Each structure stands twice: as structure tokens, then as C-alpha cells.
Amino acid sequence: GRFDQVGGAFGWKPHKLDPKECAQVAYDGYWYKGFGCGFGAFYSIVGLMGEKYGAPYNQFPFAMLEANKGGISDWGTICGALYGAAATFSLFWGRKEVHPMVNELFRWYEVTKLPIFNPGDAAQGVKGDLPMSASDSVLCHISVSKWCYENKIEATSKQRSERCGRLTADAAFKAAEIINTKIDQGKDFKSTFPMQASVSSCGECHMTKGNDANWAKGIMDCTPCHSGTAATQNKFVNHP
Amino acid sequence: GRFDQVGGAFGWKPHKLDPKECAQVAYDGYWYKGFGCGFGAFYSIVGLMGEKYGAPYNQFPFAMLEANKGGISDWGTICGALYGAAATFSLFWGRKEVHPMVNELFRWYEVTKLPIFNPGDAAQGVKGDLPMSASDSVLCHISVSKWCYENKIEATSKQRSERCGRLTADAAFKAAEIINTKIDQGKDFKSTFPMQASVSSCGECHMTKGNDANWAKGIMDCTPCHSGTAATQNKFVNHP
Ligand code: HEC
Ligand code: HEC
Ligand code: HEC
Ligand code: HEC
């Protein structure tokens, strides 16, 4: 009936992946027809399962993930690579089970200095080395803008598009490892990245049912936006 | 070949839909197995097309959209309803064409007071009117938290669960209108919502090629985060 689907909800069969292969295809996918972060990462997971094991994986409308490029048509929201990777988890597991998987993928992203991946000369943007940094944000605007600012590189530069291309690979690689670990540990799976400090402490009031201050939703690290930093001071007045 | 898909990229045949139908369906879909905002929205478009026209629409793994519940596994990033609705656009059109569609849907969401949709006695979460407001953000965290704060409503209440359900309906409604208009107008589609003030004013420096300060990526309204409001001041020291 209505709301149901071919194969049932979360009824696809997961298959272990080769993280190295994934990082690679994700990076390549990123440049393909200029589809981007979401497409490359998504494809490196479900796309590779399709090439090796056929249906249902190979029946997916892959380019739909172009939607996530630039945090969804340049709105700079969720980093496309992150969505593309986490979305695949929902093809196999449901809400309760996917939560710790995305928590690990997302918390890892906030703290790890990236990119790590290097295509060598398979580089389609700029060959070379790129500065690494921890974004402390799963949001594209924050991740990209901070890095460009800090490194005096333009968000239009071939470098930042090379950077996002490599990040797609790192996220693909990490997501792949998480999928593998999930297949192994079954319903025992646990995130290896503990809850963020700010999330836990602020959460005491803002994310605890019954609390008079329990208004907030979202477990992104609170630090970037709620720290009174120069960046978050009023830029609409006296801002050269 | 690798990276291609059944039907070619953006190869689906779009069909006009009834906005009021989608709104109703999206609202139901929202509660179905607790799948949420992204599931209802996406389904009310592609799902209905499946029910009414068959393959390929009816072949889609709908439950994957549960990935988006609560701003992606409770992370509070892009609102599930917005992503779910926008995603559908990429099944029929390429990024060039989709950009103005997402721009209108997202801008519409920022400036419009919601929710509008009212299931009356058919409310599946909690019956009754709900306070409306413009979020100024396509991010579930800012949208929800600010609304709970300003109305003193726990983010864990049925009231807010009901609000997000209604919001899903509004989003689905608007996306259908956009899709319909896009079908009629073809390559001449233009968004009714213009670029936000802060984005083009701040963008003059930050999102313009060649300018030293060209570091930012993202066309979200800059006001909530770069205004030095009470909210963005340091909440880590002397708070509350
Ligand atoms: C409970 C002991 C709290 C902790 C821990 C933190 N906050 Fe809080 N916050 C609390 C209350 C009761 C209130 C409202 C009344 C008031 O004191 O003004 C707030 C309000 C906020 C706001 C609103 C804007 C403001 O005026 O400050 C924000 C955006 C907010 N709190 C953020 C926040 C963050 C991110 C925290 C951790 C770093 C944090 N609060 C902890 C109660 C408590
Ligand atoms: C930036 C992307 C943010 C992150 C990460 C977190 N919050 Fe936030 N929060 C942000 C803004 C710009 C706003 C809107 C403020 C406004 O104009 O109303 C909010 C709002 C909240 C609120 C509600 C009170 C309010 O000022 O509206 C709370 C209680 C809050 N945020 C808490 C908070 C905590 C505890 C977070 C970490 C898990 C968190 N926010 C992250 C921007 C951002
Ligand atoms: C050009 C005339 C600009 C306009 C208009 C705005 N910004 Fe800006 N910004 C510009 C420069 C050259 C710099 C360099 C540092 C400085 O203070 O001179 C910046 C920097 C920022 C920053 C980060 C650095 C900081 O002050 O902490 C942010 C967060 C930023 N700008 C945001 C921003 C927004 C939101 C604007 C509109 C309200 C805005 N800027 C306009 C140049 C120009
Ligand atoms: C909140 C959800 C945000 C919105 C909407 C916009 N920006 Fe932003 N911006 C925000 C944060 C938390 C940061 C990181 C600050 C840090 O600690 O480094 C940024 C960063 C930028 C930058 C880079 C410089 C920097 O301070 O790191 C710029 C130039 C900037 N933001 C500009 C800007 C403009 C013009 C926006 C609207 C189109 C905009 N930001 C929205 C948070 C958020």
C-alpha cells in the first residue's frame, strides 16, 4: 500500500566495501559531470555495490545526489559528502541503528584535520598539497568559509574545489569503514567518538526533557556559533 | 558505464501534481513509522507519482529519506522537509535548472510564517492551533530551537512534533507548486523570491570572484549568525 516500497523499508542486503576503493571512486565521482560531494560519496557506496552485485543497488537514480552539491544548491548547509554517505545507511538500517553510525561519521568530521586523501596525479583540479584543518562543523558554509579565510584562498579557487573533492574521498573512506564495522558488530555497534563536550554540558539544560530550558534540537558542536567570537559579533555595523 | 544510471541522469518524466494532495500525504507520511519530515515530503511527490504512474517512481527506496529526520539523524542541519522536497527536483532536472527552484523553496521557507497547514481534528500528534513564525533559517536547529524558545515549548513536546509534521505539509505544498510552475515554464523558470538583502550586501565582498575577502560559500541569510545577537554571544562563560 501507500508509504511502502519495493524490497521493504531498510530491506537491502549490505555488502562489505573496500574503503580505499571507495575513497577513490568518490573522488572521481565528485568531478563526473560536475555532480559533486554528495554524488561521488553516495555512488562510491551504493554505486560500487551496483557494479559488483547488480540490483537493487544498480537501479538507483544516482544523479539525484547532485542535489547536495554545495550544501544543496550552494546554500552551504550539510556537507554533501556527509549526506551522501550517511544516506546509504538508511538503505539497510533504520533510525535507531543508524544513529550511532552517523554520530561517528559526523563527530569524526568535526575534529579530524582534513583532507587526508591525495589523488596524486589523478588530480583533476590542482595537483599537489593542501593545508589541512578541523572544521568543528558538519555545515559546508562553516567548513569551507573558515578554511578559505584562514588560508587566504578564494572560495572560487581551483584549490578549494580540489579540497572538496578530496574531502568527498575521506568521507567516503570513513563511511565505508563504519559500514564494514556495522556489518561485523551487528546490533552491537557503538560509536567510537564520544559525545561532544559542549553538546553534553549545554545539553544538560537545553536538551533534557522536563528542563525549563529544554528548547534546542540538534547535536552539532555548539562552540562555533555560541562563543561570542569575533566572527559572530555584529558584522552589519562597523565591519571593514 | 560507471557513474551512469538507469534512465540517464535527470531522466524521469515529471508530472504535475495537486499541491493540496501532496500537503495531506506529506503530513501523513511524516507520522508513518515515525519516518519524519524528509520521508513525508519526498514521498508526497515521487511516491504519489509512483502510485499514479508506476515505474520508475514506484521503484524508489522511500524509507531512505528517514536519513533526514531531525536535520539528519537529530543533528539539526538542513530541515528534512526542505531536503526531501528539493531532492525530488534532481530526478527531473540538472543543477543549472534546479538552482532557481531550490532558491525559491529555501527563501520562501526563511521569510514565511509557518506552519500554515492545519489538520484540525485530524491532527495525529496534537490538536489545535500553533504559534507561527518565520525561522530565517533553512536549518532545523535554528528553526526549531528559536520557535521553542520564543513560545516556551519543550523541543520534546507533542506540540513541536505536530509543528514539524505541519511544516512538512507546507514544504511539500510549496515544492509541488514549484514543480508545476517549472513544468509549465521550462527553461524560462525564475524564482518569485529575490536574493535576500544581507546575502547580496555581504556577498558584494564575500561571494564575489576577485575580491580579497571572497572566502564564503553559502547563500543562507547571514543575519542570524553574524549579527552579534544575545544568542551568538559567549554562552560558555557566565551563562545563564
Ligand atoms: C542551564 C543551567 C543552562 C546551561 C547549562 C546553559 N544554558 Fe543556555 N539558557 C538557559 C536559560 C534558562 C536560558 C533562558 C533565560 C536566560 O538566562 O536568558 C538560556 C538561554 C540561552 C540562549 C538564548 C539567548 C540568551 O539570552 O542567552 C541560548 C542561545 C543558549 N542559552 C545557549 C546555550 C549554550 C549553547 C550552552 C552551552 C555552551 C548553554 N546555553 C548552557 C540555561 C542554560
Ligand atoms: C550554528 C550553526 C549553531 C550551532 C552549531 C548551534 N546553534 Fe544554537 N542557535 C544558533 C542560532 C543563530 C540561533 C538563533 C538565535 C535567535 O536569533 O533566536 C540558535 C538558537 C539556539 C537556542 C534557542 C534560543 C535562541 O537564542 O533563539 C538554543 C537554546 C541553542 N541554540 C542552543 C545551542 C546548543 C546548546 C547547541 C549545541 C548542541 C547549539 N545551539 C548549536 C546557531 C547555532
Ligand atoms: C566588504 C566591503 C565587506 C562587506 C560588505 C562585509 N565584509 Fe566581512 N569581511 C571583509 C574583510 C576584508 C574582512 C577581513 C577582516 C576584517 O575585519 O577586516 C572580513 C571578515 C569577515 C568575517 C571573519 C573575520 C572576523 O571579523 O572575525 C566574518 C565572519 C564576516 N566578514 C562576515 C560578513 C558578513 C556576515 C557581512 C554582512 C553583514 C560582511 N562580512 C560584510 C569585507 C566585507
Ligand atoms: C549560521 C548558521 C551561519 C550563517 C547563516 C552564516 N554564517 Fe558565516 N560563519 C558562521 C560561523 C560559525 C563561521 C565560523 C567562524 C569561525 O569560528 O571561524 C562563519 C564563517 C564565515 C566566514 C569565514 C571567516 C571566519 O570567521 O571564519 C565568512 C566570510 C562568513 N561566515 C560570511 C557569511 C556571509 C556573507 C553569510 C551569508 C551569505 C554567512 N556567513 C552566513 C555562521 C554562519
UniProtKB/Swiss-Prot annotation, chains A, B:
InterPro entries: CGCAxxGCC_motif, Multihaem_cyt_sf, TAT_signal. [2Fe-2S] cluster binds at residues 37, 79, 140, 164. The N-terminal Gly is blocked by a labile group with a mass of 85 Da. Predicted to be exported by the Tat system. Heme c 2 binds at residues 141, 222, 225-226. GO terms for molecular function: 2 iron, 2 sulfur cluster binding; metal ion binding. Keywords: 2Fe-2S, Electron transport, Heme, Iron, Iron-sulfur, Metal-binding, Signal, Sulfate respiration, Transport. PROSITE patterns: TAT (PS51318). Binds 2 heme c groups per subunit. Each heme is also bound by the other subunit. Binds 1 iron-sulfur cluster per subunit, probably [2Fe-2S] cluster. GO terms for biological process: anaerobic respiration. Heme c 1 binds at residues 202, 205-206, 235, 239. Coiled coil: none annotated. Its cofactor is heme c; [2Fe-2S] cluster. Pfam families: C_GCAxxG_C_C (PF09719). Diheme cytochrome c which may be involved in sulfate reduction. Homodimer; linked through the 4 hemes that are shared between the subunits. This is Split-Soret cytochrome c. It comes from Desulfovibrio desulfuricans (strain ATCC 27774 / DSM 6949 / MB).
